[PDB]
Amino acid sequence: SLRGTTQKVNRIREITAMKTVEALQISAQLTQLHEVDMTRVAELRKKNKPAFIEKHGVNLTYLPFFVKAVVEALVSHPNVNASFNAKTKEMTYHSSVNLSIAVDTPAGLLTPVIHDAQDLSIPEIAKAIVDLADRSRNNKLKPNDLSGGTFTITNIGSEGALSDTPILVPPQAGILGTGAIVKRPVVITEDGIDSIAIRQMVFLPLTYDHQVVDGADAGRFLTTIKDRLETANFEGDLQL
Amino acid sequence: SLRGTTQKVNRIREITAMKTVEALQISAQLTQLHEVDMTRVAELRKKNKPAFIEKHGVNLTYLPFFVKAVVEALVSHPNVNASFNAKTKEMTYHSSVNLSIAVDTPAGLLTPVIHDAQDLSIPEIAKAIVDLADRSRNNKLKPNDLSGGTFTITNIGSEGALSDTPILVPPQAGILGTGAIVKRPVVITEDGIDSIAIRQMVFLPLTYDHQVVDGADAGRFLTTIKDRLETANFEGDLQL
Amino acid sequence: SLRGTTQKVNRIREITAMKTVEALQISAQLTQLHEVDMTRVAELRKKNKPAFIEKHGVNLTYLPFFVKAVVEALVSHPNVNASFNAKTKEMTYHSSVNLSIAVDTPAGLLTPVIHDAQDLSIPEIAKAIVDLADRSRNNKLKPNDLSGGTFTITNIGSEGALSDTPILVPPQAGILGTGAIVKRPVVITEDGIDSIAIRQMVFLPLTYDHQVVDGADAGRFLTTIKDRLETANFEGDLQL
Ligand SMILES: CC(C)(COP(=O)(O)OP(=O)(O)OC[C@H]1O[C@@H](n2cnc3c(N)ncnc32)[C@H](O)[C@@H]1OP(=O)(O)O)[C@@H](O)C(=O)NCCC(=O)NCCS
Ligand SMILES: CC(C)(COP(=O)(O)OP(=O)(O)OC[C@H]1O[C@@H](n2cnc3c(N)ncnc32)[C@H](O)[C@@H]1OP(=O)(O)O)[C@@H](O)C(=O)NCCC(=O)NCCS
Ligand SMILES: CC(C)(COP(=O)(O)OP(=O)(O)OC[C@H]1O[C@@H](n2cnc3c(N)ncnc32)[C@H](O)[C@@H]1OP(=O)(O)O)[C@@H](O)C(=O)NCCC(=O)NCCS
Ligand SMILES: NC(=O)CCCC[C@@H](S)CCS
Ligand SMILES: NC(=O)CCCC[C@@H](S)CCS
Ligand SMILES: NC(=O)CCCC[C@@H](S)CCS
Structure with a gap:
């Protein structure tokens, strides 16, 4: 159907094309890679998946564990949950952790935001991801659901990738x-x-x-996340 | 000989320097990484190498297998075999797969093109790579051998690399x-x-x-390539 | 303390922010990755560490081995120890190897330089790294300690990273x-x-x-470094 045609792109694609090209020119992006042993999280997840769906109504994936560890690391590493103003040379260290989640939709990639993620438990995170992904896919977002993010998590493993060099979008300073x-x-x-x-x-x-x-600084931030996930003390966090 | 001197670069180096710096400023480049089990292709290649050289006159390397899988994936993922016009916001989905091949030469890197690669068998691909590499190294290319490419394959493993973040050159949208x-x-x-x-x-x-x-989209495209290479149903494709 | 505040950044941070954003716009950066078997170096290092501290007064880390192999590779690959002038299209092949070393300090990243590193032995390299890191951390550098670098080595493994895509700063052409x-x-x-x-x-x-x-060219340069480290003929180089 598409093959051999020239067509005007939809608005999501046009915005993504414009934002990503610009983002790279107004920031200094680089990608640091660490490896984490997820065995303990995988075992905990497998053991508690039936009780989690029964009590909280949503499937328990790996993403709420990554979100919980990342949000706690952004509170203990405030230098990462920050924005730089190149005109005034001032750094703003945000008190809220507004976590953007990349969501693959048929019309294109959307990045809705979990505002004040630092106040959420693992069940609340799991429910917020499901709500944002559903509303992203069914055109039920409001403008404030797509702005205010202080950091992003992108699940590149959803389509088989071991790694990527994801593009951050200023004023954010990091994307995992x-x-x-x-x-x-x-x-x-x-x-x-x-x-x-x-x-x-x-x-x-x-x-x-x-x-x-x-x-x-990136290494120290990633080491905090790695140690939290490898220890996997998340039983109480599941609220079962 | 070079050490301690300042010399005007040759034309290939000057063009590469200009094109690569510009390319990054008019695109939003990122590199996604997948791992593929090449054992079945390696066994098939080892078993059929003598019969391939005897019938087709050229050595059978891994590159024609990567080219065949990539070209079929570009036909089934037309969104990747495409070009974006940032001025009109139109995407052009190409009907031809014109596959650029990076060729290392003593005067510098050249990227000749296999036009209409979707119409070629593995023996025809193997012969086209040999012809393009030979003519690139002996100054026997014509201008149209270096233009019209819709995607590129670069053999970074030729000099031992596990991985790289290769630079794409617009209007192309991908380089593997x-x-x-x-x-x-x-x-x-x-x-x-x-x-x-x-x-x-x-x-x-x-x-x-x-x-x-x-x-x-990149993950779905790479998954198609990975599944084709891992299954390695290429016996009939060798035309022996 | 930082959380919930907006503060003017220190001079090191302001300079880094300015230099790294600009560097990417005036160069065509990409990152090639190779894997090296460090077992022989690790065994040699473990066996000679006590005699090294006793004779030379400094701890023997892996960094002087990486520096020795890299500096020898920059002499045998002069095309890498070079700078490009995009205005005149001239390449300058440096006769000195002035090796920049990234140093993590509490006020921010600094990149002091070991001038004429090609004339140094492993003990002299080990001592120069200690001197530069100490003076970087105690505000005892002079302006010429931070300029003239022809290549950089950055120890990303210091904080646990397997890999990164470090940013080079022109006129340098490479950073390992x-x-x-x-x-x-x-x-x-x-x-x-x-x-x-x-x-x-x-x-x-x-x-x-x-x-x-x-x-x-990057692959051939990295292959020279890899073969030097894997053979690990550094006993005589330790001057014990
Ligand atoms: C909204 C979204 C992030 C939710 O992801 P999620 O919480 O992991 O949920 P999913 O329903 O997609 O996961 C399906 C299954 O795959 C598993 N899975 C997902 N990501 C995984 C990963 N990185 N590694 C291994 N398993 C993974 C989940 O645990 C779940 O397993 P199960 O059915 O056995 O319980 C996801 O649907 C999405 O859009 N991903 C793509 C993000 C994107 O496009 N990023 C851009 C760069 S690719
Ligand atoms: C023109 C070119 C692409 C042809 O590559 P090719 O089809 O693999 O052919 P070669 O003759 O170079 O291969 C020699 C051998 O290495 C093997 N080989 C090549 N690439 C390989 C890889 N990625 N992994 C393992 N083996 C590989 C081949 O199978 C062949 O093996 P054999 O002699 O046992 O049959 C190649 O010569 C070239 O120029 N490569 C460099 C490309 C480049 O500069 N890219 C830029 C980023 S580095
Ligand atoms: C100045 C500097 C480079 C010196 O590094 P160094 O020579 O390795 O010395 P250190 O004292 O920090 O090393 C401490 C120990 O860690 C080990 N180590 C350091 N880097 C290592 C690595 N990549 N892999 C494994 N071990 C390593 C050393 O061998 C030493 O071991 P030992 O105490 O058992 O003898 C370092 O302190 C530094 O600043 N690193 C960070 C560089 C940076 O910020 N780069 C930016 C990108 S992250
Ligand atoms: N909807 C968009 O415009 C998103 C553009 C940026 C995507 C990044 S943050 C994640 C994938 S690299
Ligand atoms: N001959 C050239 O100017 C090629 C420049 C671009 C090279 C890329 S596509 C492949 C290596 S990153
Ligand atoms: N002190 C600085 O301005 C250094 C900026 C560049 C750092 C690079 S070379 C190393 C880490 S990517």
């Missing part, structure tokens, strides 16, 4: 991609013995703006 | 890198049993223009 | 990141037998300017 969670052979070291284990591993590429965040 | 194919330990899951196998693995970084392709 | 050195299961092939070994592996992302270096 959640790669595909894949079983991999990894090395475990305990009591001086190196051995090979099968673990659920994920790559987390973080695109950050070098105007706001330096490489070591 | 074929990383070095390396034996790696990977996890196989069958009948509920996780186990470790040695497989020939490759990383395929795709740089795409966010004006034309969103992240989920 | 040293990822976190991690034990991984890898495939060894000897006498026709494929087997799985535990090795200390590192990813080395190289951001290069496409105005100066093409992808195959």
Whole structure:
């Protein structure tokens, strides 16, 4: 149908094309990659999935665990939950964590926002993602659902990708991609013995703006997220 | 010889320097990475290499398999074999797949084009790559051999790289890198049993223009390529 | 403390913000990734660490090994230790290797320079890194300690990162990141037998300017570094 034709793009595509080209010219984007052992989260998720759907009415995916860890890291690393004004040379450190979530829709990519995500529990996050994705796909968003974001999470693993260099959109200073969670052979070291284990591993590429965040700051922020996910103390957070 | 000197660059270098700096400013480039199990292609290639050289006169490398899978994916994903006009907001979906191939030459990188690649078999692709690389290296190209490309494949694995973030050149919307194919330990899951196998693995970084392709579209396009290569039903395609 | 405030940034942050945004607009940056087996260097380092601190007064980290291999590669690949003037179309191939080292400080990232690094031994490199990092952190640098660099090495593995797409700053044409050195299961092939070994592996992302270096040139340069590190003939270089 499309093949061999020239057609005017829809408004979402036109806006995305304009915003992404401009975004790269008014920021200094680079992507740092860390690997995280998601096995404990995967086991916790598998064990509690039936009780979660029964009590909260929504499916329990990996995304609310990534959101909870990222939002707590943005509170303890306020330098990342920030915006730079290149005209006045002032940095604004936001008190709210307004978390943008990339949502794939048939008309194009949309980035709705979970406002004040720092006040939400894992069940509330799971419900907000479902509500935003549904309203994004059915033209039921309001303008304020698409603005005010202070950081973004993009699920690049939804379509099989291990990694990407996602584009951040100023005034945001960071966008985290959640790669595909894949079983991999990894090395475990305990009591001086190196051995090979099968673990659920994920790559987390973080695109950050070098105007706001330096490489070591990005590493410290990603280390906080990694340690939270690897310990996986989320049982109480599930409110079952 | 070069060390401690200042010299005027040759024309290929001057053009590359100008085109690549400009390309990044008029597009929104990002690179998505997937991993593909090339074992079946490697076994098929090893088994049929002698019969291929004897019948078709050229060596059988991995590149014609990547080209065949990519060209079929560009036909089934017309949204990727496309160009965006930022002035009129129109997308042109090309009917031809004119596949650019990056060729390393002593005077610099050249990107000759296989026009109407969708009409070619694996032997015809193998011969066209050899012809274009030879004419690129011996100053025997014509101007139309270097224009009209709708997508590019760059063999970054030729010099050992696992991955890269290759630069696309508008009006193209995508450029795929074929990383070095390396034996790696990977996890196989069958009948509920996780186990470790040695497989020939490759990383395929795709740089795409966010004006034309969103992240989920890139993932769906790369999934089509991955499934074609992993199944490796190419015996009949070899025309032996 | 920062949360909920707007504050004027310090001078280092203001300069970094300005330089990194501009750098991307006057160059064609891309990042090629190779993997290197650091096991032999790790064993050599562990065995000689006590004798190194006793004789040279400084701790022996992995960074002087990366610096030695990179500096020798910049001498044998003069096309990488070079600067492009886009106005005159002239390439300057530097005779000195002035190696910039990224240093994380509490006030922000600084990039001091080891001038004429090609004339230094591993102990001299180890001492120069310690001196530059100390003076960077205690406001004891002079202006010429921060200029004249021909290439940069950035230790992204200091804060846990496997990889990054570091930003180069013109007139430099390349910046190498040293990822976190991690034990991984890898495939060894000897006498026709494929087997799985535990090795200390590192990813080395190289951001290069496409105005100066093409992808195959970057691969050849990284292959020289990889072969030097994997052979690890550095015993005599330690001067113990
Ligand atoms: C100045 C600087 C480069 C010195 O690094 P260094 O020579 O490796 O020295 P350090 O004292 O920091 O290293 C501490 C230890 O970590 C180890 N280490 C450092 N980098 C490592 C890496 N990439 N992988 C594994 N181990 C590493 C060292 O070998 C040393 O080990 P040991 O105590 O057992 O001997 C470093 O302090 C720094 O500032 N790094 C950050 C650079 C930066 O901000 N880059 C920007 C992008 S993140
Ligand atoms: C709205 C959205 C983010 C919700 O994602 P989600 O919370 O993971 O929910 P989904 O219903 O899509 O997930 C379906 C399944 O895949 C799994 N899954 C999703 N992402 C995964 C990942 N990164 N790795 C492994 N499994 C994953 C989920 O756990 C779930 O598994 P289950 O059915 O066994 O319970 C998602 O539909 C979406 O739009 N993703 C694409 C985002 C995008 O386009 N980003 C741009 C760059 S690609
Ligand atoms: C023209 C060109 C693309 C042809 O590549 P090709 O079809 O793979 O052919 P080659 O003759 O170079 O390949 C030589 C061998 O390496 C193998 N090989 C090539 N690429 C490989 C890869 N990615 N992984 C593993 N093996 C590979 C081939 O299968 C062949 O093996 P064999 O001799 O055992 O049969 C190539 O010569 C070239 O110029 N590559 C560089 C492209 C470039 O500069 N890109 C820019 C970014 S680096
Ligand atoms: N709807 C849009 O215009 C989104 C453009 C930016 C997308 C980024 S933040 C996520 C994928 S790289
Ligand atoms: N001959 C050229 O000017 C090519 C410039 C662009 C090269 C890209 S498409 C491939 C390597 S990133
Ligand atoms: N002090 C600075 O302005 C450094 C800016 C550039 C940093 C790069 S070279 C290394 C991290 S990407």
